């Protein structure tokens, strides 16, 4: 009945460091006529994704750590 | 008939800086039993997405520029 998903953002909320070690995927997109702020979408290991910080600026470090965690090639 | 998408990666190839200013979305995911390397997926403005560098390490700068391009709040 009532509405809980309209002119809000990319998600009701977001995490600054979703189950990091679990983060098995990520999705960053700019804001729109409501999100009023960039937002991302990270997936975890096991089957559980969601929306994360705005480009994880404060968590960027831990993020750059997740992005640089592919130094196995 | 022939197969062109098997034990390869997240995409046939990837861009180090897809239509950046157009990049209207992004998706970063780790490699698997074939990609042998982290890969991402960025979308452009107009309706055209694809796979980008591996966390755009060399292009990370221009990327951090796209991630920090939300300083309008």
From Swiss-Prot, chains A, B:
Homotetramer. GO terms for biological process: cellular response to interleukin-1; cellular response to lipopolysaccharide; immune response; inflammatory response; neutrophil chemotaxis; positive regulation of cytosolic calcium ion concentration; response to amphetamine; response to estradiol. It comes from the Eukaryota. It comes from Mus musculus (Mouse). Disulfide bonds join 9-35, 11-51. It is found in: Secreted. This is C-X-C motif chemokine 2. GO terms for cellular component: extracellular space. Keywords: Chemotaxis, Cytokine, Disulfide bond, Inflammatory response, Secreted, Signal. The keyword Lipid metabolism does not apply. The keyword Transferase does not apply. Its main location: secreted. One of its GO terms (molecular function) is chemokine activity. Coiled coil: none annotated. Chemotactic for human polymorphonuclear leukocytes but does not induce chemokinesis or an oxidative burst. Belongs to the intercrine alpha (chemokine CxC) family.
